[PDB]
Design a binder for these strands. Structure first.
Lengths: 123, 260, 185, 134, 125, 50, 149
RNA sequence: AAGUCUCUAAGCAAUGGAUGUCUUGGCUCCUCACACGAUGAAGAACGUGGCAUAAUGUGUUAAGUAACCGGAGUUGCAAAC
RNA sequence: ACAUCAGUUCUAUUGAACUGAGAGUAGGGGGAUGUGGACAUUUUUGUGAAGGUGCAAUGUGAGUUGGACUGGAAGAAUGUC
RNA sequence: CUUAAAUGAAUUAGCGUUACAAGUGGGCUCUGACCGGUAAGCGGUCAUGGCGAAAUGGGAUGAACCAUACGUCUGAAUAAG
RNA sequence: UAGUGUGAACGAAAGAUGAAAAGAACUCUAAAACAGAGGGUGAAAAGUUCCUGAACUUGCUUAGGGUUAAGGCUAUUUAUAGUACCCGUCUUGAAACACGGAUUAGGGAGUUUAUCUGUAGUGCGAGUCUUUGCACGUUAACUGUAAAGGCGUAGAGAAAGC
């Protein structure tokens, strides 16, 4: 389909403060509540906070490098959801789904023309 | 009395240990170990479920009698029953009433031979194929696979009918005299597929006439939907015309600036 | 940098907080009219359906007989509330009424004297303009909780009724309430 | 669905009763169907297994051999058999245990109690099929 | 104490939390009662289980003069008027009460007619 | 021990966040006023309606 | 239940909505009604005035089935509510003669009668224990009788 | 301006026992019962099995014996029936 | 140019066009993510479930998802509780 | 009841009323006014502002002074300096 | 139970091979029941406190950085430029020569009851609640129902009386 050039506004993931230093601290973001914290204050040479400023365009949200918005597909019955919205959304088959039913979902998709985003399972 | 079985006195400051309670005695290795606190290993947990607790909710009896009325109303109305998750197919009309000679059925060949003729055995086939798993640890205490809740069958009196339908997966017998939400609207989802008997079905106007405190609930509207009311010419003549927003230009307005 | 006062002092209820079909439905009927016809009557009926159940006070049937005494026939008493019958009123007049619900005692009384029992979606066909209608409302302060509201008791004179389980002597009648025991409020 | 309250339907209780049953119940739990030659002869499907008789297993490494029962085991809950042997890495045959519900009984040897059990179940099976009406 | 709430009146200064009494017995208690009175009525047969017969009796104080309830037992006067043997009438299935002697003439005429309806269709095995 | 006794630094700030003008209900205050005046003002009203 | 509490959203926040400087602690004031004449007096004075002190006359062995305490009341405007509505419609169509219906208050649990509102001009007979002055006056004016018990 | 040193990352290991999955164990609620003992109880000690220390049976008739009721090997090796 | 939160003009059925604003400790409100178990509804799995290790996307973010290696039997989704 | 005549400063703005509840009840300080003190980065008050809870730039460096109070970015021209 | 104390007393840690022991014969180096290496068993070594086998720490191999203690953020032609004090905490004020903090995993703290308050939702409405209990039951549920009782419907007064 037709759309804008996709542009992300931030490239990388946000780290928690002091997470680089310590293995106990996981690098998933947490808003710092320290009273004397430099980070809460926003001094220079701290990372910028995640916030509604960084929100991507309402058109291009959840959109892949390809073009299509990935809906997850768990079975043959769930593939009926993408019949209406054919060239806006696109399929993404689950990791649980085994090698036999993988081939059946591809064969069903090539009939109905739904682009499957999962790639190179192998064999 | 759990976790407080141990002795424990809390040492004090001076020893460069935290002031938490510590079990006393010597040589066990257990001794000199923190105990009696929620954070300690084998301490009393923070407020686990008590008998003190209120378990049962006294739900008002008018509102109980309201809900069995609305669930029986919803057992008609063929949008709702398939919107739960049924395979009623054809015939598509609901409810299904059945002649009272079926109430004398004894053996289960006849009860299965009933359901496929009236066209309900699609919903029994939905139970038999396609079992449903318990992802959780609940498997240790209550059976690894659940079963689907299929049709429902109602009779005023039992003549071995209960024995006949018992043992077929997914069908739940009730008397008309009882009735219940757990049967009629399971998981608070109205419209289960009901197979009435004639003697059950003809009782219902007798039942709900002569119930003591309850009386039968009114609606606020007279109609089902609005769209007939607005589109009528009685309303439409009075309305103003439907407006729509102009988008505004971004730009020499004036006809002669060159006089200046 | 701009000098404004960013705070909101006043919220107002826009749509109803009920999770019914029917109250939400016939709100949108009278919301649709209140916009489009551009009229003071339908704007009020729209807003009355928004407001909580405490403010929709139950307008009793003897108050309905007093309002309509004088007013000629083909005049509906529109009323965004429940109607409840009076024991003490004896012979009801023949009267045309519209409300959300009646009590089953009151509906028997109005119908038995040749009256009418009209719904709001029924009324939207009949009278979109509200010509020869009559909006009525119960008084807001008739609730018992409302008597506890006001200046704190003991302000000389609050007349506000202190929050008490048990009445009589012994419970809150001495040092404060009477001038013998030091002072009177 | 069960009506009798005194029998339990919890999995904890049933396994504990099953593994720590009395000796007489464990012999009944160790049982197998007859081959169709013996079904028409004696008039029963199901019987408990002894050290006299011999048995025949479909599906396995030891697929489709007859062989006599050397030992029943009620704690270990399995049956040793003649013929059913893999050798060790040492030149030494060791008999290999198999659960009887996988297995069909090909020949049977009588006992006063075994004949007295069979004459009961024959008369029982005549009553029940007349009741159901097949 | 804070805000506009009423004075804090909770009778919870004793160690109530040791002396707790939970009523999860109640529906099992219902069956222990119910299975008793069925194991009664079989043993009592052929005699009627809803008995023994008891008098109609006016309640005492000013605000229950209206109402009439079941008493304990009939007087020795009321039995002899009706046609009964005071001592033996216990074993005929009629409760007897020697003490009550404030019952005036109106309520005697009920209780004589009450016993006559019993004695009309009592029969002996 | 010895901490501050008072301040008025930001009394003004708080007062002005909201100096609401409390309006009087009516100019007569019949608890006060002359009884001899109000006594006659009753008999003006009582005589008129008859 | 436990999902909808404000406590659940205050994870991460360190004080759980109870302050840093004050520190939420078990006995600020003292227990229950404590310091009512001292340091919590302002609460008592402001919200529940008259709490302290003794007034009245001591009553020993009060019973409420006596006909000294126990008087339920009913009003003149009703009474007709006690009787069903078929009765008084027949009683309206009657001569100055016979068959005037007896509204028994005492059976229904109402001893005294009290005139707050109107009646019609139907004849009737009130059996009750007591009346007011104005209730006795209104029942005469309707055209009916005041029996005592 | 040197590094086999030190710092960071990835892959294969060592150490360690988290996670996930299992469950003949708990916990609670309800039901039924309480009929221990000078006819020697509860508790303690020591004996006793072919290889048996603890526990469990059991008391020089000592993993038992007799009678009645079940009714064929209730486990490693050895032995007998 | 883009995001968010308000508001203004309109709109039935959840939207449209346009304008304005931007710190935040103690603290309050709104919407959302994740975990143990439950009741419905729908599935996945020895053609390899959960788990674990690295990598590439995706969401402002809490998170979520793909494919590779390891593992060898169960897991997950949607709506309410 | 009514006989006359009008909306009779500027600039701005919708205004009124109720209920429930959090935190708080150690403050510090620039510029002026002031009490005590030889004086103090001392003690105690007053008026507006600031910090506490306010980033960024400037005073090399600094909670408080100057410019200015902040969504994510791309430029232009400036403020203090 | 192990174990501690003269004693009254005190009191741990510790589950999982595989479907089945098929629990690793025999040979070679060696002083050898040291320790391996061949060769085999099994679907797969899962090889004896043996399922999965995370982090901290360590070893080997591969690739780069290093006078700036290291780490972070922004920007690109990827080793440079600019920037960047250590978090949590009481405090008017913390990078402080204030206190807590060697590393990692797993546990770890506003919950529930009674008597009330106010707001919102729901049902009935001068009424309302059906529960103590009885009758039912596919049985602690659900369902049906008689009569009391609770609060409301009239208040003021110390009280008589009203």
């Amino acid at each position: 389909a037709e759309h804008k050039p996709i542009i992300h506004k931030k490239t990388n993931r946000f780290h928690r403060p002091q997470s680089d230093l310590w293995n106990r601290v996981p690098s998933a973001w947490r808003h710092p509540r320290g009273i004397d914290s430099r980070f809460r204050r926003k001094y220079r040479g701290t990372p910028l906070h995640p916030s509604a400023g960084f929100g991507s365009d309402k058109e291009t949200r959840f959109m892949l490098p390809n073009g299509f918005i990935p809906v997850i597909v768990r079975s043959l019955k769930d593939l009926d959801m993408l019949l209406t919205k054919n060239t806006t959304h696109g399929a993404m088959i689950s990791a649980q789904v085994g090698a036999k039913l993988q081939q059946e979902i591809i064969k069903k998709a090539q009939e109905l023309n739904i682009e499957i985003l999962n790639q190179a399972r192998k064999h | 009395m759990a976790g407080k079985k141990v002795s424990a006195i809390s040492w004090g400051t001076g020893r460069a240990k935290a002031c938490v309670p510590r079990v006393n005695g010597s040589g066990s290795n257990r001794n000199g170990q923190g105990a009696y606190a929620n954070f300690c290993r084998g301490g009393h947990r923070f407020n686990p479920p008590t008998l003190l607790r209120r378990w049962f909710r006294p739900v008002p009896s008018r509102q109980r009698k309201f809900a069995i009325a609305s669930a029986i109303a919803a057992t008609a109305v063929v949008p709702l029953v398939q919107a739960r998750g049924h395979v009623l197919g054809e015939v598509k009309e609901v409810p299904i009433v059945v002649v009272d000679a079926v109430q004398e059925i004894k053996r289960t060949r006849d009860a299965v031979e009933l359901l496929k003729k009236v066209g309900v055995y699609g919903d029994v086939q939905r139970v038999l194929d396609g079992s449903v798993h318990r992802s959780s640890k609940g498997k240790f205490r209550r059976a690894a696979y659940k079963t689907k809740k299929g049709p429902l069958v109602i009779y005023n009196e039992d003549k071995g009918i209960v024995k006949a339908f018992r043992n077929i997966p997914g069908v739940e017998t009730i008397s008309v005299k009882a009735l219940a939400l757990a049967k009629l609207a399971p998981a608070a989802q109205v419209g289960r597929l009901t197979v009435w008997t004639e003697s059950a079905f003809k009782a219902l106007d007798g039942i709900y006439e002569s119930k003591k405190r309850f009386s039968l609930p009114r609606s606020i509207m007279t109609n089902a939907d609005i769209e007939a009311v607005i589109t009528s010419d009685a309303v439409q003549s009075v309305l103003n015309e439907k407006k729509e927003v102009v988008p505004l230009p971004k730009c020499l307005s004036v006809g002669a600036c060159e006089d200046w | 940098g701009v000098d404004l006062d960013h705070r909101v002092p006043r919220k107002q209820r826009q749509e109803p907080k009920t999770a019914d079909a029917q109250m939400k439905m016939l709100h949108n009927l009278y919301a649709f009219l209140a916009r489009r016809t551009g009229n003071d009557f339908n704007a009020k009926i729209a807003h009355r359906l928004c407001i909580s159940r405490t403010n929709r006070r139950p307008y009793s049937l003897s108050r309905l007989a007093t309002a309509l005494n004088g007013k000629e026939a083909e005049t509906i008493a529109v009323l965004v509330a429940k109607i409840t019958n009076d024991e003490r009123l004896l012979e009801v007049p023949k009267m045309k009424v519209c409300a959300l619900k009646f009590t089953e005692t009151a509906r028997a009384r109005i119908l038995a004297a040749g009256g009418e029992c009209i719904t709001f979606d029924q009324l939207a066909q009949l009278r979109p303009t509200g010509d020869k209608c009559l909006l009525l409302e119960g008084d807001r302060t008739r609730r018992l909780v409302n008597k506890h509201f006001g200046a704190a008791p003991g302000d000389d004179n609050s007349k506000t009724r202190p929050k008490v389980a048990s009445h009589g002597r012994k419970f809150e009648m001495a040092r404060g309430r009477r001038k013998s025991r030091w002072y009177h409020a | 669905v069960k009506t009798n309250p005194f029998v339990s339907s919890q999995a904890r209780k049933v396994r504990k009763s099953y593994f720590n049953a009395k000796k007489d119940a464990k012999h009944v739990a160790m049982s197998a169907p007859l081959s169709k030659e013996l079904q028409e002869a004696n008039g029963i499907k199901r019987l408990p297994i002894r050290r006299d008789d011999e048995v025949m297993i479909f599906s396995g490494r030891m697929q489709n051999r007859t062989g006599k029962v050397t030992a029943v085991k009620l704690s270990e809950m399995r049956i040793y058999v003649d013929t059913f042997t893999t050798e060790k890495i040492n030149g030494q045959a060791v008999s290999f245990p198999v659960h009887p519900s996988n297995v069909v009984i090909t020949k049977l040897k009588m006992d006063k109690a075994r004949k007295n059990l069979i004459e009961l179940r024959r008369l029982g099976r005549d009553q029940i099929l007349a009741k159901l009406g097949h | 104490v804070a805000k506009n709430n009423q004075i804090p009146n909770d009778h919870l200064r004793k160690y109530w939390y040791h002396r707790v009494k939970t009523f999860f017995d109640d529906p099992a208690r219902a069956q222990r009662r119910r299975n008793a009175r069925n194991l009664r009525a079989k043993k009592i047969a052929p005699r009627p289980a809803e008995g023994p017969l008891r008098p109609i009796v006016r309640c005492p104080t000013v605000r229950y003069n209206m109402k009439t309830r079941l008493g304990r037992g009939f007087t020795p006067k009321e039995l002899v008027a009706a046609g009964f043997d005071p001592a033996l009438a216990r074993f005929q299935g009629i409760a007897v009460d020697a003490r009550r002697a404030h019952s005036k003439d109106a309520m005697v005429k009920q209780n004589v007619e009450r016993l006559q309806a019993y004695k009309a269709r009592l029969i002996k095995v | 021990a010895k901490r501050s006794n008072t301040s008025a630094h930001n009394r003004s700030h708080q007062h002005h966040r909201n100096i609401h003008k409390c309006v009087v209900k009516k100019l007569w205050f019949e608890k006060g006023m002359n009884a001899k005046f109000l006594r006659n003002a009753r008999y003006a009203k009582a005589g008129q309606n008859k | 239940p436990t999902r909808f509490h404000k406590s659940r959203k205050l994870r991460g926040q360190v004080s759980m909505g109870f302050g840093r400087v004050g520190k939420h602690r078990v006995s600020p004031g003292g227990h229950g009604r404590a310091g009512g004449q001292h340091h919590q007096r302002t609460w008592f004075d402001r919200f529940h005035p008259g709490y302290f002190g003794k007034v009245g006359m001591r009553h020993l062995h009060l019973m409420k089935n006596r006909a000294d305490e126990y008087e339920p009341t009913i009003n003149v405007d009703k009474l007709w509510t006690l009787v069903p509505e078929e009765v008084r419609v027949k009683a309206a169509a009657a001569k100055k003669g016979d068959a005037v219906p007896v509204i028994d208050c005492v059976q229904n649990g109402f001893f005294k009668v009290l005139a707050r509102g109107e009646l019609p001009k139907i004849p009737f007979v009130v059996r009750a224990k007591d009346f007011s002055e104005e209730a006795e006056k209104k029942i005469k004016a309707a055209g009916g009788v005041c029996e005592k018990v």
